């Protein structure tokens, strides 16, 4: 009936401080996609399980350090609505596993093709009330990814 | 006050979807403020060469892999106005550029002032909006979008 997609919000506690003063709370990964839009890592499933496809896609897009974990059904968060069903997952990593994913991503299959690069989501809001999170949210996103990010940030009290 | 930034680029024979030629890998950064921009930053009076200062900040922002090249006066391209943003474009090999991408993840600024690097998609998808025209509707810092555009016309794209 539908064409199934799976995306994953990968995040890690980050005790780091911007400019020595501003607290990042989490490292949260999103990808700049080949179409110029921010989105979550993942894609379409085809693949013995929905978690199989998602993890395969994560490997193709993030590289082999994505085999150091495995997004399982336990990690499964939401399903949003062409005839595409968007299955949203969230996976808590150590900042270690996440840094390693940032390094390995510059040499995944999709580097420079489908994936134009990774970014962290600024959770802070800067001085003038625009810089940081609010400005970040005014870029362009693939369908729902802004809503899945907002949905997920409040599932963490943020 | 003066700032220096650098468009670093290299030929990629990659064919997106097997059909769309990526012509050049062109490197921009997502800054801590949620805006796209070019590697670089403010130049000082302990740098007494605009070029010395720019290379220093690409060491800070991209890591030691940026030591495999130097951006020079001969690469200068524009200035815009108080701060004065000086802009340079530097041709690298893909392997050099690639080294900078994998270096950037271990640079000082990674995870703080630099949220991550992104390439510029130089193509337009068939719908006529995906790719370069949508990328250009993202938020940019300072003169960075016009510097991106001048650089793309002066390279004939
Ligand atoms: Mn100009």
Residue numbers in the entry:
A (entry chain B): 18 to 63, 66 to 100, 104 to 180
B (entry chain A): 20 to 100, 105 to 180
What does the article say, verbatim?
The Nucleoside diphosphate linked to another moiety, X (Nudix) superfamily of proteins constitute pyrophosphohydrolases of substrates that include (d)NTPs, nucleotide sugars, capped (m7Gppp and Gppp) RNAs and dinucleotide coenzymes including NAD, FAD, dephosphoCoA (dpCoA) and their derivatives. Among the Nudix proteins, Nudt16 is the most promiscuous. Similar to DXO, it can hydrolyze RNAs harboring an m7G cap, unmethylated cap, NAD cap, dpCoA cap and FAD cap on the 5′end. To understand the molecular mechanism for the recognition of FAD-capped RNA by Nudt16, we determined the crystal structure of human Nudt16 in complex with FAD at 2.7 Å resolution and the structure of free human Nudt16 at 2.3 Å resolution.
The overall structure of Nudt16 is similar to those reported earlier, with rms distances of approximately 0.6 Å for the dimer. The loop containing residues 101–106, located near the ribose of FAD in the complex, shows substantial variations among the structures and has weak electron density in the free Nudt16 structure.
